[PDB]
């Protein structure tokens, strides 16, 4: 696998955290494969099926001062070239400014668009551009499921998204998408018509393919996924 591009992470602590999640779900995938091959049944209660956060839209321009994406919450993020992020909530009133922190890797600050700080004014002009184009977070109820994009990597066969809740999303050339969550225990298949279905990974392995989508070439995709995770874990 040869990454054509990826965002630059300047923080060693951030890189450690990223590598840990890559390591974590790769281990999970390998364990699911071991359960399939050797038949062990974990004492642990099975993973509750929960649809993960997904990236529904993204764009990688060179001349607009950032990478941008939309999430299934309809939140819009801009990943700026210095590695900071503005995450604009779908309500079009609140946003997070996310920057580096020497203790936690990333830190997020809560703002209102109506009370925009002057030192983020140009950031929000860029965010406004991408909002037009498209059309960490505490424990408050409105924010407890908030997620942002920590790292993306573009490969020829797929683009890989690493979300802040530990979910990994893989968009393949054939417009089949797969998201791995819950430490590699759950796989979410997103069809080319955006029909979303989530399964325990071990169940898909035993079945041999994604239910309802025999053309999705699951085993090749899972191999690519493992290669992606393995590579990113070495940084
Ligand atoms: Zn380990
Ligand atoms: Zn808020």
């Amino acid at each position: 696998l040869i990454a054509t591009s990826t965002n630059v992470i300047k923080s060693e602590i951030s890189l450690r955290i990223l590598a840990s999640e890559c390591h974590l779900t790769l281990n999970g995938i390998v364990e699911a494969e071991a359960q399939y091959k050797m038949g062990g049944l974990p004492k642990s209660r099975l993973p509750k099926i929960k649809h993960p956060m997904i990236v529904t839209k993204w764009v990688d321009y060179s001349n607009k001062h950032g990478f941008s994406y939309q999430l299934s919450t309809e939140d819009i993020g801009v990943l700026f070239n210095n590695g900071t992020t503005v995450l604009r909530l779908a309500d079009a009133e609140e946003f997070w400014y996310i920057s580096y922190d020497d203790r936690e890797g990333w830190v997020a600050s809560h703002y209102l668009l109506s009370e925009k700080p002057r030192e983020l004014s140009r950031h929000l002009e860029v965010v406004d551009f991408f909002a037009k184009y498209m059309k960490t977070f505490g424990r408050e109820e409105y924010h407890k499921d908030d997620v942002f994009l920590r790292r993306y990597t573009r490969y020829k066969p797929f683009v890989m998204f690493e979300l802040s809740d530990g979910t990994f999303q893989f968009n393949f050339k054939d417009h089949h998408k797969m998201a791995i969550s819950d430490g590699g225990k759950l796989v979410t298949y997103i069809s080319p018509s955006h029909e979303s279905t989530t399964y325990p990974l071990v169940e898909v392995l035993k079945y041999g393919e994604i239910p309802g989508y025999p053309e999705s070439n699951f085993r090749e995709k899972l191999t690519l996924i493992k290669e992606g995770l393995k590579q990113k874990s070495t940084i």
Side-chain angles (χ1 to χ4, degrees), residues 1-9 11 13-36 38-44 46-47 49 51-56 58-102 105-114 116-134 136-138 140-155 157-172 174-205 207-226 228-229 231-235:
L1 281 178
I2 303 299
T4 47
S5 71
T6 184
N7 57 305
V8 182
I9 307 262
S11 184
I13 181 163
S14 292
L15 289 174
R16 281 204 297 280
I17 294 167
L18 285 164
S20 181
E21 297 293 336
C22 287
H23 181 76
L24 177 63
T25 83
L26 181 56
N27 285 350
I29 291 169
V30 168
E31 169 59 19
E33 290 180 320
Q35 286 169 23
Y36 167 60
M38 304 186 71
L41 296 169
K43 288 187 184 171
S44 289
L46 268 37
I49 281 102
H51 277 326
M53 193 61 39
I54 68 170
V55 177
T56 59
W58 65 277
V59 66
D60 192 15
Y61 293 140
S62 64
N63 65 327
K64 298 294 182 187
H65 294 91
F67 179 99
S68 186
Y69 55 97
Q70 185 174 304
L71 300 176
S72 44
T73 54
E74 292 181 354
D75 303 328
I76 292 168
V78 179
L79 177 51
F80 293 89
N81 291 334
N82 70 348
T84 64
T85 292
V86 169
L87 185 68
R88 178 203 190 267
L89 275 76
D91 56 28
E93 167 56 3
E94 305 205 324
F95 72 93
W96 296 100
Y97 177 63
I98 303 160
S99 56
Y100 288 133
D101 179 75
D102 55 29
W106 296 266
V107 58
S109 287
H110 182 291
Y111 290 106
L112 308 180
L113 289 171
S114 62
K116 146 194 101 172
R118 45 206 199 176
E119 69 272 16
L120 295 178
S121 182
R122 63 167 58 94
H123 306 66
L124 289 166
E125 293 301 306
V126 171
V127 167
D128 177 67
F129 170 87
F130 283 112
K132 290 166 176 169
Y133 171 84
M134 290 295 177
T136 326
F137 303 111
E140 264 273 288
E141 282 82 5
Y142 199 65
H143 292 301
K144 78 187 185 190
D145 288 321
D146 284 10
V147 172
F148 74 106
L149 178 66
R150 292 168 156 175
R151 182 165 63 191
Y152 69 86
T153 309
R154 283 229 256 170
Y155 304 102
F158 63 93
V159 55
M160 173 178 181
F161 302 109
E162 303 175 59
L163 303 181
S164 61
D165 60 354
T167 291
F168 295 85
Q169 183 174 332
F170 304 83
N171 291 7
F172 302 89
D174 61 356
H175 208 57
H176 300 291
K177 317 178 195 326
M178 288 170 50
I180 305 296
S181 61
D182 194 17
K185 293 189 219 64
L186 295 171
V187 54
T188 296
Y189 173 81
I190 307 145
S191 76
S193 59
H194 297 165
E195 296 245 308
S196 178
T197 43
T198 298
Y199 306 87
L201 176 56
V202 64
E203 177 180 330
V204 171
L205 291 169
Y207 190 93
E209 37 177 41
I210 304 291
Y213 298 93
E215 72 276 21
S216 55
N217 289 337
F218 168 76
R219 183 61 254 187
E220 171 59 19
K221 286 174 176 28
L222 189 63
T223 294
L224 286 166
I225 285 173
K226 293 171 65 183
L229 295 163
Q231 191 180 106
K232 297 262 86 154
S233 72
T234 69
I235 321 189

